[PDB]
Amino acid sequence: NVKDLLPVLENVVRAGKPLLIIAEDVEAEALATLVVNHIKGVIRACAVKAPGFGQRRKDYLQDIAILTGGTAITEELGIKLESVTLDMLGRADKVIVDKDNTTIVGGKGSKEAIQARIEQIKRQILETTSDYDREKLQERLAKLSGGVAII
Amino acid sequence: NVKDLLPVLENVVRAGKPLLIIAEDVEAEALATLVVNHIKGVIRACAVKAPGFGQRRKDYLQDIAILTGGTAITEE
Amino acid sequence: RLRPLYDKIVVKRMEEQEQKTPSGIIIPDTAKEKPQIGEVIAVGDGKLLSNGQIVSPKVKKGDKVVFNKYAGTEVELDGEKYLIMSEDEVLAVI
Amino acid sequence: RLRPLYDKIVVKRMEEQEQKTPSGIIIPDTAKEKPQIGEVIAVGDGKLLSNGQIVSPKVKKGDKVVFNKYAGTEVELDGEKYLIMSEDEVLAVI
Amino acid sequence: RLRPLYDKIVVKRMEEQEQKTPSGIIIPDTAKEKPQIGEVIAVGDGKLLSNGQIVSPKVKKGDKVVFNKYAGTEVELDGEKYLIMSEDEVLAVI
Amino acid sequence: RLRPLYDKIVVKRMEEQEQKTPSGIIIPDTAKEKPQIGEVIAVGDGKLLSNGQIVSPKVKKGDKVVFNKYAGTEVELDGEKYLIMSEDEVLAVI
Amino acid sequence: RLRPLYDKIVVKRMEEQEQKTPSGIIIPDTAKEKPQIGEVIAVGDGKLLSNGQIVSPKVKKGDKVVFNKYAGTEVELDGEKYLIMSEDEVLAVI
Amino acid sequence: RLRPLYDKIVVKRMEEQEQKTPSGIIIPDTAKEKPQIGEVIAVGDGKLLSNGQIVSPKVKKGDKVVFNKYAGTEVELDGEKYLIMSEDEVLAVI
Amino acid sequence: RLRPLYDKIVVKRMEEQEQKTPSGIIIPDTAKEKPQIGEVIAVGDGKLLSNGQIVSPKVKKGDKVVFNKYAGTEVELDGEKYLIMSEDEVLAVI
């Protein structure tokens, strides 16, 4: 819907900074707002699909909210999308968006967090050996702590 | 719903002690109340699913109820 | 051209514009509601009471009324569209 | 021929004369609505109030009256077609 | 014989009379709707006003009256049939 | 025995008569409807107007009143049954 | 104890009385309806006319009245139950 | 504090009690409807008549009234719930 | 800015107060309800009676008015939100 998309736009036009949207989807009525606004140059923004399904959804965006310095607006937290503001709107330095891929460089924040995640995820990695059969859990550690190389 | 969770929340905030919920399932408007209250630190609480299935629920909570010294809130 | 009878009022519905917020945000036409603001082009003789008395309408030629989101008949007149509407469904003025 | 009673009015719609857009665009008859503008054949004595008083009809014989898309029963007489009406469902005149 | 009460009227419809167009085209009885034209048989005292006064009905006797289709109960009586009818749904006369 | 209030009327139907056409055709009871013609046992004081005035009912003891299909409430009185009905739903008399 | 307001009346039912036909046939409780006969415990002030006048209720404490089918609101008082019942929905008295 | 307008009434219900029948049987709270007995705390100025006159409400402060099983708006006032209610839907008093 | 007509009122609701219980429990906005408390901005002339008399509204623009759950219709005025409503659907004041 258009209505809830105004408060986020209202905040970003005030600061004059680009916006990146991560959500389950942005349908035509909402999407038409940004793209029309994007051509006129009042904002420079892009919208992307959420990374994964189910529990894989929750894990991914929680990590994303961590290195960006903001927070994830979840159903549990209960913040209505109308009432969101700049305070918990996360930040980054550079983002690259292409037809099927998005990359976030990182805000260099949450040092105590990223050291923490290294701990339980490895503590979870050893415990998940009974069930896991994909590097997605190690890659989850790798993405926020190092990088990945594809030979 | 909040209309029932709040009165029980009203009693525990007066006592100022931590609270534990065992219920069939809490995933909705009621659930968001505790976690937003827990984040603000007004109470320290958690909610858990009840064990078993069918008949295997009530016997378990009855064993838990007598161990804890309270009483199980049954529909009976 | 049209003269309303009794309590009827004929209104022009503020025409169409592209709406922009004071912050400069433009809303696409697919997400805009038809304006509720209108200007009266003519007024009727007045509401006819149960006793036969007629009360003069308070709306005038140069005012700005607001509709209750649905009122009107959307008449056509040589390509021009007017909104015949009634006093009891007028929300407010200016 | 026929005459109405009390607040009833006898109106004939403007019927179809192969209407066209003023710029020259022709619209097929399969995509047009029956005209909502018509002229009155006869008028009744007037609205009968609850106290018995009769108010003379505002509409006259030579007036052109528009109606709200569902004007009347559309009765037939001697092979000609009349659309009876009443002032409460009258929207505006000329 | 049959006496209407207050504003009720006693009307006899025209009944099928081998309907056919003036051009000579015969329409089968399975494709014709019951006539809307009725003949006044008996007239009641009149409508009861809210104050208690009585208004004389404006139909007198034997005048042809047109009705909006489902405007009577089709009262059952020996021989010739009738449908009782009120004044406020009377369409037009003569 | 029973007496009504205001505009209510106690009416007794024509009861079973084994309906037969004048030509001698006998209709089975499974294909006939309860008679709409009845007789009045007693009448109330009359209609209560909005101003408090009372108008005498226009129906007598010996009148034969015909009503619509569902104008009653089917009261029971120590074995016999009567049709409680109001003045506005009795369509005509005799 | 309980006193109604304006035209309201408070009435008790006739209570389950071991219903049986005069011929001696007993109907089981699973196939009988609550009695429509009741008597008045208290009477209100009466109807509020449009001009403010108060018509004296025509029902009396000692008589018995009949409800249409579902009249009443089933009020209860220290284990005893009454149906508070409106004057204009009374079928008849005695 | 809170005061009504015209015919509105503010009523406080009978609240929750450990209900028991006179025989001593306790009904669980899951099998009871909210109490229908209330006490009047605030009284409005009175019903607006058609002619404009004002009639003093018959209910008084501290009286006990019964609601029509659903009346009220369940409004909250200063950490407490009140039941704003209207005269035409008050059942009976004391 | 804007002014109402007849019985219409202009009310500003009590906005997003971030509801919290007196005990200190914070309810998330996803679990709250739109406040029923509103501040009056403009008051119309008053209710227009059937005889043409105008009664001064009892609201005085300087009081707290509580509506029903879905009373009034939203109107937008140069960026802010206002809820206009009639005088007979607000249930209590102050």
UniProtKB/TrEMBL annotation, chain A:
Transmembrane segments: none
One of the GO biological process terms: protein refolding
Keywords for this protein: ATP-binding, Chaperone, Cytoplasm, Isomerase, Metal-binding, Nucleotide-binding
Subcellular location: Cytoplasm
Coiled coil: none
Main subcellular localisation: cytoplasm
Domain of life according to the entry: Bacteria
Cellular component aspect of the GO annotation: cytoplasm
One term of GO molecular function: ATP binding
Function, in words: Together with its co-chaperonin GroES, plays an essential role in assisting protein folding. The GroEL-GroES system forms a nano-cage that allows encapsulation of the non-native substrate proteins and provides a physical environment optimized to promote and accelerate protein folding.
Quaternary state and interactors: Forms a cylinder of 14 subunits composed of two heptameric rings stacked back-to-back. Interacts with the co-chaperonin GroES.
Family: Belongs to the chaperonin (HSP60) family.
Record's protein name: Chaperonin GroEL
Native species: Hydrogenobacter thermophilus (strain DSM 6534 / IAM 12695 / TK-6)
The encoding gene: groL
Automatic annotation (TrEMBL), chains C, D, E, F, G, H, I:
Location relative to the cell: Cytoplasm
Predominant localisation class: cytoplasm
A GO term, aspect molecular function: unfolded protein binding
Keyword list, A-Z: Chaperone, Cytoplasm
InterPro entries assigned: Chaperonin_GroES, Chaperonin_GroES_sf, GroES-like_sf
One GO cellular component term noted in the UniProt record for this chain: cytoplasm
Transcription in keyword set: no
UniProt key word Cytoplasm: yes
Domain of life: Bacteria
Signal peptide (UniProt feature, chain positions): none
Stated family: Belongs to the GroES chaperonin family.
Its biological purpose: Together with the chaperonin GroEL, plays an essential role in assisting protein folding. The GroEL-GroES system forms a nano-cage that allows encapsulation of the non-native substrate proteins and provides a physical environment optimized to promote and accelerate protein folding. GroES binds to the apical surface of the GroEL ring, thereby capping the opening of the GroEL channel.
Subunit-structure text: Heptamer of 7 subunits arranged in a ring. Interacts with the chaperonin GroEL.
Protein name: Co-chaperonin GroES
Gene this chain is encoded by: groS
